[PDB]
């Protein structure tokens, strides 16, 4: 049925849209009403990964994606766990309409490098809620600069309408599939 | 997936 | 994770005491107020594991890192068809000694386990919880024991409130897994 | 731990 079970973890302040980003990705659905995640949760999706071919060459592997959702209010608490060190890649979100959630991205990355299976784990940075342009407060150049300083991909996404959700997740999938041994 | 603090088993690694 | 990282899943109808049992085990604490579990949750515990022979000869302790997963009873059988569920190494199956229907539903639970776990015969320990409520007890001990014998699984009557048999039941499940696994 | 539906990697199996 599947060739690889791949586990990713979404992170970021409460309210930035972690639950909604996973839900729009796996089910194509979105709920307006905020219900904070307690404990932890997950979703799964079977996808097909076609590799980045050199010179342009095909070889599509069945991936079983397992997408873990964290409680933003628990903050930095379950970083201590063997569970966390089993996460293969990180989808790090902030809220394009919340400067404070963006200002907290530096410490999230620091916390990530300190507790993951690697001091340089794969991270994809998402500026979520791009559909609320009238309430935007984070300037694209600042977000792009921050991603460039750390060397991680940056996407502006919307869990409401799906814009760039799959692109961001497939980018994380690609990093892991190229870093993993025997592939 | 081999890391400096831990190695993740991929159902390679 | 030092010698081994072992993962268990606790199951049963809503209200039987899954969250309270795992919390009593990891923290020795209990709360009377019912806060039903939404989604999933887990607690981790470092414990020492001491193998026992058939004669009772005890080997040296091994450091186990236990990862104990807690499930929502209201989503009864929601997605036993996930890769998450197929990664549970063993199951702590609970019912409530004060709720006969939760006990009558144990057969269906075992059926659903065997159809959806990593194996057709996964390790199971049956707990009859809330043994501290003697006046409210309704499940007949002889019938719980008969049922356990039929499926060949250990049975413990536990209390999340006062802690009785909680370590024993989890330790027996750990013993089944350690005995069963392949090592390098 | 080897099963008819899935092999669980234990950090043996
Ligand atoms: N317009 C819009 N609203 C969004 C978007 N993503 C999330 N929201 C809304 O913002 C709120 C928070 O979403 P949610 O996914 O619960 O955030 P979270 O990161 O999971 N928070 P927590 O960590 O507390 O569980 C909800 O009201 C949700 O509908 C988005 O892309 N666009
Ligand atoms: N006296 C007593 N009360 C218990 C015991 N175990 C649980 N309870 C109580 O019974 C209720 C249910 O406990 P809880 O652990 O939430 O059950 P659950 O199986 O996790 N329910 P859910 O599936 O809805 O999350 C709570 O009010 C709790 O205080 C026990 O051994 N003794
Ligand atoms: Mg959430
Ligand atoms: Mg509960």
């Amino acid at each position: 049925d599947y060739d690889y079970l791949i586990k990713f973890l979404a992170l970021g302040d409460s309210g930035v849209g972690k639950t909604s980003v996973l839900y729009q990705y796996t089910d194509g659905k979105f709920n307006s009403k905020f219900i904070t995640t307690v404990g932890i949760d997950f979703r799964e999706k079977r996808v097909v990964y076609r590799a980045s071919g050199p010179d342009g060459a095909g070889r599509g592997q069945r991936i079983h994606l397992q997408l873990w959702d964290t409680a933003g209010l628990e903050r930095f608490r379950s970083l201590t766990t063997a569970f966390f060190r089993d996460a293969m890649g990180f989808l790090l979100l902030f809220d394009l309409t919340n400067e404070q959630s963006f200002l907290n991205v530096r410490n999230w990355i620091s916390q990530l490098q300190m507790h993951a299976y690697s001091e340089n784990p794969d991270i994809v940075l998402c500026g979520n809620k791009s559909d609320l342009e009238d309430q935007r407060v984070v300037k694209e150049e600042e977000a792009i600069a921050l991603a460039e300083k750390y060397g991680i991909p940056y996407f502006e996404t919307s869990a409401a309408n799906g814009t760039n959700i799959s692109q961001a997740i497939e980018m994380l999938l690609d990093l892991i599939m190229k870093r993993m041994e025997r592939s | 997936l081999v890391g400096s603090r831990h190695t993740i088993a991929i159902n390679x690694r």
Side-chain angles (χ1 to χ4, degrees), chain A residues 1-30 32-45 47-49 51-58 60-73 76 78-84 86-98 100-132 134-140 143-147 150-180 182-183, chain B:
Chain A
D1 48 337
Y2 66 72
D3 304 319
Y4 299 93
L5 165 56
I6 299 291
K7 308 173 170 178
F8 290 148
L9 187 64
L11 300 153
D13 287 13
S14 176
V16 301
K18 307 181 292 296
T19 296
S20 301
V21 160
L22 306 181
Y23 189 39
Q24 171 74 236
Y25 177 64
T26 67
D27 290 54
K29 296 178 160 201
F30 165 82
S32 322
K33 172 211 203 176
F34 179 30
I35 305 187
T36 201
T37 297
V38 310
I40 197 149
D41 204 6
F42 79 89
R43 314 199 72 90
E44 275 168 15
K45 194 191 197 185
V47 301
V48 183
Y49 169 78
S52 211
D55 194 67
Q61 300 101 246
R62 279 164 139 85
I63 307 318
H64 197 111
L65 278 197
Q66 182 180 82
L67 305 148
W68 286 90
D69 190 13
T70 58
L73 283 175
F76 317 104
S78 99
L79 288 209
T80 74
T81 58
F83 164 90
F84 183 78
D86 252 358
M88 313 172 183
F90 302 100
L91 193 68
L92 176 52
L93 268 89
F94 71 95
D95 188 346
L96 285 176
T97 75
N98 191 286
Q100 179 68 52
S101 88
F102 177 66
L103 296 181
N104 289 348
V105 167
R106 273 174 212 270
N107 197 44
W108 278 108
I109 300 182
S110 154
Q111 295 300 316
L112 276 166
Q113 305 189 313
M114 279 188 285
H115 299 90
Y117 83 103
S118 161
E119 67 281 69
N120 306 108
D122 301 297
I123 303 174
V124 166
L125 179 67
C126 292
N128 193 47
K129 305 193 196 184
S130 68
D131 69 277
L132 299 174
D134 276 351
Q135 293 97 345
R136 179 154 180 162
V137 316
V138 176
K139 313 194 56 154
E140 180 175 54
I144 284 191
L146 189 77
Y150 291 87
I152 63 200
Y154 172 66
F155 290 94
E156 296 193 344
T157 59
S158 164
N161 61 33
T163 302
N164 276 328
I165 303 266
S166 98
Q167 292 78 347
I169 288 149
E170 286 150 24
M171 167 79 57
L172 190 48
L173 180 54
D174 195 50
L175 291 168
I176 274 70
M177 289 300 276
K178 293 166 169 176
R179 187 161 170 178
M180 76 167 291
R182 144 65 55 69
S183 158
Chain B
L1 179 49
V2 165
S4 63
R5 316 191 242 252
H6 175 247
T7 278
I8 297 158
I10 289 179
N11 202 106
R13 21 106 110 145

